[PDB]
Amino acid sequence: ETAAAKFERQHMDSSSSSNYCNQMMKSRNLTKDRCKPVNTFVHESLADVQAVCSQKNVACKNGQTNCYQSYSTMSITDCRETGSSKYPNCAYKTTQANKHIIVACEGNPYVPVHFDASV
Numbered sequence: 001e002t003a004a005a006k007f008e009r010q011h012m013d014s015s016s017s018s019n020y021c022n023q024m025m026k027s028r029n030l031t032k033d034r035c036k037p038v039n040t041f042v043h044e045s046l047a048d049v050q051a052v053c054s055q056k057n058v059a060c061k062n063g064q065t066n067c068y069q070s071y072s073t074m075s076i077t078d079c080r081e082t083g084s085s086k087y088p089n090c091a092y093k094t095t096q097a098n099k100h101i102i103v104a105c106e107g108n109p110y111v112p113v114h115f116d117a118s119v
Contacts (some may be wrong), residue, residue: 004111007040011115023092043074066105067105074098
């Protein structure tokens, strides 16, 4: 699995409910080795998200310079692990929102490889 493929698996859902995160985090294998604390799914088309790599260049949280912020807000779902959540039964809080996304891009083709933040 490539870095680009991994990004699509972990963050893309172009296809809501209170149990969305509980179902999605498991189906996308984000709770295999451990309960991933937080994760975000983007409901926009792959083309629209891949297009962010040519948008607003901004600094990455880690200090690298290959991050890009979307010019338009995007429909996203933030997943956050609850306190009562215990592996292997990872429980998540599903929250829908419309915000600008920031992703790190790499390669040729230059595509998203890391979801940095939502603003």
